[PDB]
Structure 1
């Protein structure tokens, strides 16, 4: 019943594709055309929240709305027929065993729908893609073929239903705003340019223009048009059975006609044609969004002229092949290797959609959040590392002097927007992710000097981590932290990082773990700001502080830096250097944090202290050691049944969330992941955690759940518990957290367990009968096994990163290349090999692991390593081998350089 890969480049085919609800496929470009296309050509087309070409949709629209893209043929002796099956007549064959043969084929990045009218002897194939040009444009090519024994007489009509305004107008002033429409017909099609826009921006003049144009393959313009939706469908008609097509009416309008005040359709009537047996005719349709009236002449020459569609499709295929060839996996599981190419696409899709504008993602307006700033750097480090350094530098401008950060991202490089009107949430984990991302950069690049670049701090009306409003703020101060004498304060990137991690350490709740604030990574743990605690992310901050300590000593060891320049007020938080407070006292830690807040609000002095890098490291290690001992001694729990794991949470009544409970044990995956990843969990505790996970969270049908079932809503904890169990942030297999769990297991050497987790995600995703999704990893697998919120999920970045840097084990260590395979025997192919092609230190490498002895992980070691046909010496034997960055950089820039790692068995 499912899709099947064809060829070796990731192309797939699915038979009878409209027999599955809710399917859609993405077409997008950098210019900003963002489309979704279903098996009957429904979906949406937009350049932003305020500029939808086709009507904004959600999931239920995909079956319930008749307004798909469409292309009609009026077939002599048969009548009206949709090339995608979206007509009332064709839809009425569903569930009667009389459905027409159909298929979807797709690739990088294009989509093809096929259909056969056996009765009439007609076949159609409709190819959709977004060209890789600088226009906001989607193209469609319909090819019709006479498969029968006699000539067919056909009258074609393209029909792209238009919306042409803000999603704010979907219902609210939907009809009123239709009165603002202005339609202009020209030789090749229809433009709609509303006179005004009425939406949440207010009432303004509009110039944005939405166009539908078309031509025959040979360049011939349409014979005429039906630009007005109500006239096209006819009195009592609809877009899946429109009178103009069904009664084969003469066109309403020719070129040069203007019509005002009506909903519009890009309905293009082509000349009738006699199609000989075995012959084809094709039509090209272009859907365009532009900032002003369209130069229809240029668009016709560029997109509709004979041969342009085909040339541009080849350009699309080459551009996407080039983007995705930066990472290629090769293993014994060829299907998973191909599925991984789709995973590899997803991080790009998230960037170019702004996590929005696909049917399930029905609320996004295309912006970026704080998390995205750091997360987007993960795939880029592997696939396109040139801009990573600049992004990281810019991102740190968003940090406040209390360690919190701006939460609305602006247009410009390192631009952040203050909202003085809405009191914003603080997410307690926002300070943890930046160091994780930045450390990866440091280890891939070797660019330790990034840490000493200067950067400003964000400043707005909100102080003491949004606990109060500063009465002294003005528009005249601007959005940057100021010194006493009025200058923009600048500190090192490292100063920003230290602040982000040290502040949460002191911001403890009544049970001594770091406060939940408005939520952590689970945005649905939003109802415990007063007394909630994220033990889960206390582990992450503990680990961050420890890594920082190690980082600083390594900076001294490598850079020779003996000193750190830090704002003088931050010396209060590095209490180990002066008069140390008791970290066992919640009162003392909170009081100290209050003194710090007072010292830096509204302004800093601008004086900096130069502090011994070892002494700062020592302070960070004291904090980290304290947190580790506290978590192990106070937050390690056990059920009566005998399983044990880490409590992740305290609720808004100050109660421990996890453990035994009426109606079942309560456990969270999030409470385990960072404990494992960061080392708070001992090896023994990690083994025990994995047993508890497998007992309480691992579902036989849907895999590793985010949490076990809490009965009913949990109004002292979060809105997540209002979702049905097994959906979204309540107990679904939430891919992002599950992948991080696997990553954590691989990091700690629990390779078979890690493998099981990663393999479960793939198996679930690829089990089409239940998942009902195309190749890729979804945001979650739900209670019924369905894949939900496709393509845009951050889990793809983590899956890609984990497969590369943990499973195949190709990763940087201070700029040097560390190779440490964690492949299991089953992953090696019929030639005893598994390989990855990957970019490192500006060179493309094919890292090939040879396991001729077919040893399991734990039974093998690196016997020898060769590069470009020559022996490489390595500065390690245990763990894995380490190759100096110079040897990579010395390779030629052109071509793929093969690096062969031969694996042999262990002695004794």
Structure 2
């Protein structure tokens, strides 16, 4: 993708887990014997071929060895450049001179989907610069960008038609027009299916390697594209790879641990922060979900596991609030167009993030940043969201004003029971149609609002707004009184109430008997009695106790029937997504609550269920998991014949949350007031660990023994 995912994709995005036809390919087909070698395992039908694929931190090297001919391919991107590098090494370890023909094939689908801009793609070929220029002049808002495919040599052949390259009666493994001839006619005329291919004839000798560099990328405007391709073709490759490796090592190198667990180190040290960044801030796209548009809570939460990133995201998020008080739950990056939904919990996430930032960094000067409002054509009581187009306004405000407006809207949006409404749904999107024109209260959002107020009372007292702090304090007292009185089920906390007054998340209901959100946040927020919180956490063990599959169920009874129509979550198959299945985002709060309450061994045991390594796919006959084990997944199915199957990985809101869990809930590393406070509770199967954090360029080797202490100097707890 170039600017926004599923808006200006370059090659096809087929989320087909069973076939997954490659969108681009690299062939090194021979001349004499006709054998076709490939570094990619999905493009090869040779049973006696060995393939090696390495997934590094910002690079991928795919090696394919067959018939004493090693073909190694490396992939990486260039920083501050919209260009993708592809380095092909054809290493000959035979005993005679071989003649080869290397191919570079790619599918041009520019925009959201093919079959729409299938005829309207223009392909060009340049003589001096051996490149293939493709543009999509029919796109709604991407009709001026050109993509290219060059090579750091003098290519001998090219084509821009699938009918010519792949042809009929052929697949990606036997492309016909790579084996049934030695001439690729250069086609420029527009036909049904566009593509691009390159060509190079090599005369190797025994013991020689040839180093190519295929280039793919784009930039708007033809002259800008030409300048960029000249620059890249004059550039080098190994320097780029070294730069990317250095950047990724230096980022992930700011926090290193040496815990005795072999599967814990390999995740927290390298993969969790990399996944968080590269799949939620840098590119909001994975194999299963593609959505390149900024979320509100998404972006607000993503940059919280770390320092300036949080500040940047807070400013950009708070600069998108309507003057009435509600914010944009969704907005595109460059146009700025978004939606104005009725979702309730959005306006309090900004308050929570500001509290977290001011607690961690301590820069009180962040509260004064004049940022404009927006202008929107209001809402009607007939719809739940509208797209329109925001317009900047001349009415400015600071961050404190924005947070105050958000809280004022939240307080105004309360039901008759005291607990806040949900309208279009709280954190769980599927739980909509419980408010909408009625009185749908909630318990999780009540806890979360009380938690935010618990610190904005202090902030207002420091600032000096007596009228506002008095109102907020009175409201907080009333809300916590309601939570203690209305919201308790007898052994745990409820979830909410429908429009009909029927309790949701209680033992009296046939479906959704027990939630987890309220129980976890009753400890996360800070309020609530110790005994009631302990009883709630013990009752959480009802859906946790399933250690046969190792998941943490959100609902014990999945929504099978529409007894009260809790929204569009009823459509999910039982045990799929947030319908009674494990949801890694919510279980992280469970492990954080268990860790903070004091129970250390239980917290570690629960965390072991979340780590993809030493989970399901640890042995060879763990085919049930089906998903890659080096990255945390969003959800794991919990019922039916697909119990234990993981789905929709990489693009998960659980990256930063799991990372922060592993940081303080286990290791106990907290930046309370700038100074680091260490307070660990090691499991009985551990002895000790050593952490190496580099805050403000200061690398400290904080080593914790069985009881306490530090390697640099002996200090007590809470350093």
The 1:690–1:462 alpha-carbon spacing in structure 2 relative to 1, beyond 3 Å, is same
1:192 corresponds, among 133, 136, 148, to 133
Q: Which whole-Å CA distance do the structure 2 matches of 1:243 and 1:410 have between them?
A: 42
The 1:411–1:445 alpha-carbon spacing in structure 2 relative to 1, beyond 3 Å, is same
Q: SS at the partner of 1:780?
A: strand
The 1:252–1:352 alpha-carbon spacing in structure 2 relative to 1, beyond 3 Å, is farther
The 1:195–1:621 alpha-carbon spacing in structure 2 relative to 1, beyond 3 Å, is closer
Q: TM-score, normalised by structure 2?
A: 0.88
Residue deviations 1:465-493, cap 9 Å, x none? x7599xxxx99x9654xxxxxx7363x53
State the shift of 1:323 in Å: 2.1
Q: SS at the partner of 1:436?
A: helix
Partner residue, 2:104: 159
Partner residue, 1:121: 68
1:658 corresponds, among 505, 510, 516, to 505
Confirm whether residue 210 of structure 1 aligns to residue 147 of structure 2.
yes
Confirm whether residue 71 of structure 1 aligns to residue 17 of structure 2.
no
Confirm whether residue 735 of structure 1 aligns to residue 679 of structure 2.
no
Q: SS at the partner of 2:73?
A: strand
State the shift of 1:170 in Å: 1.9
Partner residue, 2:171: 238
Q: Which whole-Å CA distance do the structure 1 matches of 2:42 and 2:677 have between them?
A: 54
Partner residue, 1:685: 532
Q: How does 1:523-602 map to 2 (within 5 A)?
A: 523-528=429-434, 529=436, 530-553=438-461, 555=462, 563-564=464-465
State the shift of 1:442 in Å: 0.9
State the shift of 1:411 in Å: 4.7
Confirm whether residue 375 of structure 1 aligns to residue 301 of structure 2.
yes
The 1:50–1:660 alpha-carbon spacing in structure 2 relative to 1, beyond 3 Å, is closer
Residue deviations 1:522-542, cap 9 Å, x none? 111122223322222111112
Q: How does 1:751-830 map to 2 (within 5 A)?
A: 751-763=600-612, 767-768=616-617, 769=622, 770-783=625-638, 784-828=643-687
The 1:843–1:109 alpha-carbon spacing in structure 2 relative to 1, beyond 3 Å, is same
Residue deviations 1:430-463, cap 9 Å, x none? 1222222112211222222433555554442326
Partner residue, 1:631: 483
1:247 corresponds, among 171, 180, 194, to 180
Partner residue, 1:834: 690
Partner residue, 1:849: 703
Residue deviations 1:234-272, cap 9 Å, x none? 34333332122122422313xxx7443453333212114
Confirm whether residue 647 of structure 1 aligns to residue 497 of structure 2.
no
State the shift of 1:788 in Å: 2.6
Q: How does 1:100-499 map to 2 (within 5 A)?
A: 100-117=49-66, 120-132=67-79, 134-148=80-94, 150-151=95-96, 153-167=98-112, 169-171=113-115, 173-177=116-120, 180-186=121-127, 189-194=130-135, 196-199=137-140, 201=141, 206-215=143-152, 220-253=153-186, 258-261=188-191, 263-276=193-206, 278-293=207-222, 303=232, 308-340=236-268, 341-356=270-285, 358-362=286-290, 364=291, 366-379=292-305, 382=306, 385-409=307-331, 411=333, 417=337, 424-451=340-367, 453-462=369-378, 479-480=392-393, 488=395, 490=397, 492-499=398-405
Q: SS at the partner of 1:462?
A: coil
Partner residue, 2:519: 672
Q: Which whole-Å CA distance do the structure 2 matches of 1:210 and 1:140 have between them?
A: 15
Q: Which whole-Å CA distance do the structure 2 matches of 1:833 and 1:353 have between them?
A: 32
The 1:819–1:618 alpha-carbon spacing in structure 2 relative to 1, beyond 3 Å, is farther
State the shift of 1:511 in Å: 4.4
Q: Which whole-Å CA distance do the structure 1 matches of 2:347 and 2:482 have between them?
A: 21
Equivalent residues of 1:397, 1:457 under 8 A apart: yes
Equivalent residues of 2:612, 2:631 under 8 A apart: no
Equivalent residues of 1:542, 1:623 under 8 A apart: no
Q: Which whole-Å CA distance do the structure 1 matches of 2:615 and 2:208 have between them?
A: 38
Equivalent residues of 2:591, 2:665 under 8 A apart: no
Q: Which whole-Å CA distance do the structure 1 matches of 2:323 and 2:614 have between them?
A: 43
Residue ranges of structure 1 left out of the alignment (5+ in a row)? 1-32, 35-45, 481-486, 556-560, 565-610, 639-643, 855-859, 883-908
The 1:175–1:846 alpha-carbon spacing in structure 2 relative to 1, beyond 3 Å, is same
Higher-Rg structure is: 1
Q: SS at the partner of 2:211?
A: strand
1:520 corresponds, among 418, 422, 426, to 426
The 1:765–1:287 alpha-carbon spacing in structure 2 relative to 1, beyond 3 Å, is farther
The 1:67–1:800 alpha-carbon spacing in structure 2 relative to 1, beyond 3 Å, is closer
State the shift of 1:740 in Å: 2.0
Q: TM-score, normalised by structure 1?
A: 0.71
Equivalent residues of 1:183, 1:191 under 8 A apart: yes
Partner residue, 1:20: none
Q: Which whole-Å CA distance do the structure 2 matches of 1:121 and 1:191 have between them?
A: 33
The 1:810–1:479 alpha-carbon spacing in structure 2 relative to 1, beyond 3 Å, is same
The 1:726–1:454 alpha-carbon spacing in structure 2 relative to 1, beyond 3 Å, is same
Q: SS at the partner of 1:437?
A: helix
Q: Which whole-Å CA distance do the structure 2 matches of 1:394 and 1:78 have between them?
A: 57
Q: How many residues align?
A: 700
Equivalent residues of 1:73, 1:157 under 8 A apart: yes
Equivalent residues of 2:53, 2:60 under 8 A apart: yes
Q: Which whole-Å CA distance do the structure 2 matches of 1:722 and 1:844 have between them?
A: 52
Q: SS at the partner of 1:140?
A: strand
Equivalent residues of 2:254, 2:692 under 8 A apart: no
Q: Which whole-Å CA distance do the structure 2 matches of 1:47 and 1:458 have between them?
A: 23
Q: SS at the partner of 2:513?
A: coil
Q: Which whole-Å CA distance do the structure 1 matches of 2:159 and 2:192 have between them?
A: 12
Equivalent residues of 2:159, 2:198 under 8 A apart: yes
Which deviates the most, 767-776 or 719-728?
A: 767-776
The 1:850–1:298 alpha-carbon spacing in structure 2 relative to 1, beyond 3 Å, is same
State the shift of 1:545 in Å: 1.8
Equivalent residues of 2:151, 2:215 under 8 A apart: yes
Q: Which whole-Å CA distance do the structure 2 matches of 1:722 and 1:443 have between them?
A: 41
CA RMSD of aligned residues (A): 3.3
The 1:440–1:730 alpha-carbon spacing in structure 2 relative to 1, beyond 3 Å, is same
The 1:189–1:787 alpha-carbon spacing in structure 2 relative to 1, beyond 3 Å, is farther
